[PDB]
Design a protein around this ligand. Structure first.
Ligand code: HEM
Length: 289
């Protein structure tokens, strides 16, 4: 299956920067969400989940078609809680009805990462909404209760290697788990993007406990937690090397996350040779807004 990026008619960097700005200004305004975490983390997770349905074998799923708008996908148990991100983005879509759904969802993740002081993430336009019958079935997103071998194999489907998987996982510095969404509870409640996932993995005293949903998770006294799949990055020697690297080099982590996240958001998309170059949006702060 081939999905060719098609630029929204007549649109250019300036149009997309205004969408970015509207998302960013709303992230600033709507501060109270999730006990003052704000919407940044959930938008990152949304961008990931709409992309992470991709299957490299047949080019089904992926961000291109915007299929999260359809009930089958919206209602995936793996997507529980992301409705909050969708409802955040609805007034943005109303204001900018010309942007495709996949472009909006992926741009929301870009904007969130950058506004939370993360790396710049180059972003390309041209995802085109596809029909309801193109929505992938539930079950393509990963389980949390599994080991390193499961994560490694899982991510081969999305054409990600060890370094890319460890880099992407660093997003688990953001936000928190919520028992009623996923059967996991806790976390740092952070809304600043840094390399502290890796630091926490290496430096905290972790205890394997059962939560109130009867699932195991790793907890520290400071209030941090790790899923079994997170903790697996220090139980596999290949992953552990990379965790140590990123714990010790903020800039390297930023650069590798940026590359991996862009790739995630673009898997499945064919960009014509004369497509615009990737856009790098200015933050509100950089614009003096
Ligand atoms: C093995 C892979 C992964 C698994 C099993 C996993 C699982 C989870 C679970 C169970 C939650 C909690 C959801 C809730 O209760 O609200 C969560 C949250 C989150 N995940 Fe992941 N995830 C994975 C990879 C990723 C990746 C690759 C990214 C993005 C680059 C991502 C970004 C996030 C973010 C930002 C949150 C916090 C959401 C919030 O605070 O509402 N995750 N993930």
């Amino acid at each position: 299956l081939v999905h060719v990026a098609s630029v929204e008619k007549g649109r250019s960097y300036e149009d997309f920067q205004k969408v970015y700005n509207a998302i960013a200004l709303k992230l600033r305004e709507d501060d109270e969400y999730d006990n003052y975490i704000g919407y940044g983390p959930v938008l990152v997770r949304l961008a990931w989940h709409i992309s992470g349905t991709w299957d490299k074998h047949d080019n089904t799923g992926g961000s291109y078609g915007g299929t999260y708008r359809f009930k089958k996908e919206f209602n995936d148990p793996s997507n529980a809680g992301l409705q909050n991100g969708f409802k955040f983005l609805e007034p943005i879509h109303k204001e900018f009805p010309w942007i495709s759904s996949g472009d909006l969802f992926s741009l929301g993740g870009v904007t969130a990462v950058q506004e939370m002081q993360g790396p710049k993430i180059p972003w390309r336009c041209g995802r085109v909404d596809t029909p309801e019958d193109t929505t992938p079935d539930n079950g393509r997103l990963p389980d949390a209760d599994k080991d390193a071998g499961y994560v490694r194999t899982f991510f081969q489907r999305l054409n990600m290697n060890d370094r890319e998987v460890v880099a992407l996982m660093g997003a688990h510095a953001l936000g928190k788990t919520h028992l009623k969404n996923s059967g996991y509870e806790g976390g740092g409640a952070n809304n600043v993007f840094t390399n502290e996932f890796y630091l926490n993995l290496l430096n905290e005293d972790w205890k394997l406990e059962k939560n109130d949903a009867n699932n195991e998770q790793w907890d520290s006294k400071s209030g941090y937690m790790m899923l079994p799949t997170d903790y697996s990055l220090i139980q596999d020697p290949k992953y552990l090397s990379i965790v140590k690297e990123y714990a010790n080099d903020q800039d390297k982590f930023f650069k590798d996350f940026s590359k991996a996240f862009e790739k995630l958001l673009e898997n499945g998309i064919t960009f014509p040779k004369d497509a615009p170059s990737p856009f790098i949006f200015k933050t509100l702060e950089e614009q003096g807004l």
